[PDB]
Each structure stands twice: as structure tokens, then as C-alpha cells.
Design a protein around this ligand. Sequence first.
Ligand code: AI7
Ligand code: AI7
Ligand code: CL
Ligand code: ZN
Ligand code: ZN
Ligand code: ZN
Ligand code: ZN
Ligand code: ZN
Lengths: 267, 267
Amino acid sequence: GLEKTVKEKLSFEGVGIHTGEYSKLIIHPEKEGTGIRFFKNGVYIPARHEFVVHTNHSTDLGFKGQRIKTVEHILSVLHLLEITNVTIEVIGNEIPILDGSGWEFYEAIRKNILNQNREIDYFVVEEPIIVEDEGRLIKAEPSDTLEVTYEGEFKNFLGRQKFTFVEGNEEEIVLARTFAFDWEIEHIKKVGLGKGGSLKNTLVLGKDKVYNPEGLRYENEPVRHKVFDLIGDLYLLGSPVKGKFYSFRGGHSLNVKLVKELAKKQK
Amino acid sequence: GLEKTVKEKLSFEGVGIHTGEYSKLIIHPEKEGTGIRFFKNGVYIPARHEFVVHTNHSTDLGFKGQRIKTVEHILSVLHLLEITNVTIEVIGNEIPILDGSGWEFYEAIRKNILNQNREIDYFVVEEPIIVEDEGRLIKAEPSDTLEVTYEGEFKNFLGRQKFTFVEGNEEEIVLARTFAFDWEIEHIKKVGLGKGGSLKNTLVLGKDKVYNPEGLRYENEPVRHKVFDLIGDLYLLGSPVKGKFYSFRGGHSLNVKLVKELAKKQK
Ligand SMILES: CCCCCCCOc1cccc(C(=O)O)c1
Ligand SMILES: CCCCCCCOc1cccc(C(=O)O)c1
Ligand SMILES: [Cl-]
Ligand SMILES: [Zn+2]
Ligand SMILES: [Zn+2]
Ligand SMILES: [Zn+2]
Ligand SMILES: [Zn+2]
Ligand SMILES: [Zn+2]
């Protein structure tokens, strides 16, 4: 397809799920070939793997002393809509989490796409590749269309779940919310994170219960969310991706590791 | 002691722990013999047991179609400081929870006490009384000073703990925050409550862990808070109380039941 940008600037504000501080982003249009980049305190941070500075509990980008936490969701939405040229100005030190999914981002951006003149130069997976890490594993291989499957093995009532995204089913994942198990909340808060978390932006699961009064949007919302996360991290390759991926218990760390190795192979 | 009121209007505001709505209080000075009462939408609601309408998860009052939720903390502070004549005007449906303790209420009211021209007519427990409820038990008996002990038998790391308040040690209980076990969060939310709860106003305990990063102010903060709640519920007797109390696993429901039976015996 053609490269895209936004008809007019779009802005979102709220709290960062980790910083707990006010956060707001403004998406501005950019000419062809610009790519996706963030702007914070005078510094431009390209949405690329080389600028990753943290992958525990979120994917954070940094450059010249300026860091932006949790870019996975806004990037996932941009990847799914194939938005290729925009400048995301950031107020605060993290992207607003909103309700924990990509819904608000998706609905707003979707109705404001602007086709540009230049066919997209996709990052095409050319050969099979596999990165592993303590049971966790992610595999990628050639495909004319983006296809992402996430398989989880949970230690709670969820047990083993599996979900697969294919082009055209964007709406099956942009609603999946961020999630966390009660037994990991203590740790997250202890290490200086999750300061903005709440039942309003996070699905909290117990060994055999869902804390949120609204329950799950889908019986497999967690794995749908993981697919969403992976699509966001994959966009750090620099351009829309075309390949088939299968992630088994993967996380941001493994996702980024995969992205870096795919990049080395000069696809 | 002499009856007391505040020197001038005092105001407080914030989210209610249950309604999740923003509320505001205005404590108005009153003359001798007025008593403690709330005021909402033109209606006066005496801080007395006959007006209790709910005791699950909070003590709520109502009269003529006007309801005010969670009056136990402000009433406890007023009881401890012996404020006997004031009108608590509430713009909203619940008393602000603030940090979950009585600290802010205590600090402000304590610096604005106005002794009045009348000796307090204390509610004096005349004879021993006991109220029970499936394992839970509260005992009351004659005493020249207000003495309140609470014993908890918790199903988590807290185990069996005990705490005793005696006159003069007010500062040992006005800081103890509201608490709840993680296993009851799901329930509270599903029954339309705790809409304004968070780790900022609630101490969340697990089977053997404290979720809040700040931890506990006291190894027995929970029983201290239970003592604080009971002293608040006892003020529903209509006037400062003189008696020795022992509560084993009590809650608002059992507290109010004790108050009602004590009032019947006109003890
Ligand atoms: C891997 C992503 C982890 C995101 C952690 C979000 C923090 O969890 C919470 C849930 C509910 C309430 C609170 C609170 O502080 O009241 C915090
Ligand atoms: C004694 C009655 C207490 C009622 C409050 C229950 C505590 O609720 C929460 C705690 C932490 C986070 C949340 C949230 O919604 O993120 C809600
Ligand atoms: Cl209930
Ligand atoms: Zn701007
Ligand atoms: Zn961690
Ligand atoms: Zn995510
Ligand atoms: Zn209940
Ligand atoms: Zn309380």
C-alpha cells in the first residue's frame, strides 16, 4: 500500500501506567519518507530498535538523555493502520495508557488517515528465525501478509490459550487490555513502576478470579493483548512488517531481541 | 469535660471511597445541646443509630430520602476530640475518604476546638452487655474512661493480633488507614462499592504480602483501624461514650447492633 500520515494532528492525554504522571501526545503530519519518530524536550527519538532502553513491563525508547516509556501500544496501532510518517510529540515521560488497549488510538487515527505518494517499502522476513529464552520462544518466517500467533501457558485459571491475528482482523486485538496477575503487582510497585495502574486501565487476574467488575472482553483477552504488544514491538524494525510469527510465552524483552536479530540479517 | 464545637467553618474535599465521586464537607459551629448532625440537600441527619441504613463495608446514614455514606471516620475523630456540637454539611453522597485514616480530620479539628458552656452528658455503659454474630463478638462494660480493644483473627500473615485504645492515646489510631484483603476486592466492586478505592486510600493485603509499596505504618495497623472504626460507630449513641469495650472480629454491622441494644436498655 501507499505510505500514510494523518490528515490533521491528533492528541491524547491521560496518565502513564508506570509513571503515574500526566502524559499527552500530539501526532503531527509528516511528508513521505519521514518515518515514525517521537519528539521530547527538543530531541527526536526514532521509533527504532536501536533506541530501546528498557523492556521490563513495557518497551521504552531513549536518546540523548530523553526517555519515553511504554510506546508499544501507540506503535502497534500505527503498525496496524500502516501509518508511516508522523511526529509524535510527547509531554511527560511516558505514553498515556488510557484504558490499557489500543482502542482510543485506533478509532481516532483510523478516521484520519491520509494517503501519500510513495509505495511502502515493507520489512519482509526472508528466512526462518528463532530466538529463545528460558522456555520462552518466538519464531518468524516469510509471509505475504502479517500473521501473528501468541501462545500462553498461564499458572492460573487461564491455563493454555492461543490466538492468531491475520490482516483484516485488527478489531480483534485493539480492544484487548493490558493485564497483570495479582501476585506480580507487589513487585511492580516495589521496583518503581505501575504507579498509574488501576482497574480502569489494567485487567488484574488472580489464581481463579478476575478483579475487574467488567470481567474479560474475551475469554482469551490476555493472549490477544500479547499479540497486540508484539505487533507494536515489531514496528521497531523501521517499517510495516510482512511475516508469520509465533510467540510462546514471549515478552517485550524477547520481542525486541527478535527484532534486533531480524535487523542484523539485513532483510 | 465541656461540650465543644469548632471555632470556625472547616472544609474538606476529595473522592469517596465507595461512590468514586468527588465530595465536599463543611463543618459548621453549633450552640450547646445541638449534638452531632449532618446536613444534605436541606435535610438534617442526626449522627445517631436510628438513622443507620447500611453497615456492609461502611456505616451510612439517611433520613427523608437523603443518604450519606461512610461516616465512621469523621465521627470517630469527632468522638475522640469530644466535639459534641457541629453540623457536617455534605455536598455529595459520601464523606471524602482522603488518605483512608482520620489524620487530616484530626489535625484540622484539633487546632480549632472551642470549649462551650455545658458539661458533656456522656452515654455511660451501666451494666455488662454482649452481642454475638457467627463467631464475631463484642463486649461492653462499665468504665470511667473510654477503653476499646479489638482482636483480629486474620486468615493471612497477620494472624491473631490485638490492640487497645485508652484515653490520651488518640494519636496511635488516627493514622491507621483503611484496609481490605485482595480476596474481597472482587466482591466489593461487583456489589457497586469501592468505586473510589486505590492504594492511596486503602491498604491492600494478600495471603502473606502487603501490596502497597509504602507498606504498613504499624505491624498491627489493621486492628488499630478497626478500633478507630468502632469508636466512630459508638458515637452513634448520641454523645461521647464512657465504657470498656472488647471486640473480637467485629465490623460495622456488629458495632451498630451493639449500639442499638445499649440504647434500648437506655444504659
Ligand atoms: C506488565 C504491565 C504491568 C502494569 C501494572 C499496573 C499496576 O497494577 C495495578 C492494578 C490495579 C490497581 C493498582 C493501584 O495502584 O491502585 C495497580
Ligand atoms: C473497607 C472497604 C474498602 C473499599 C475499597 C476497596 C479497595 O479497592 C481498591 C484497591 C486498590 C486499587 C483499586 C482500583 O480500582 O484500581 C481498588
Ligand atoms: Cl455487600
Ligand atoms: Zn504539537
Ligand atoms: Zn520487574
Ligand atoms: Zn501492552
Ligand atoms: Zn459486601
Ligand atoms: Zn474505616
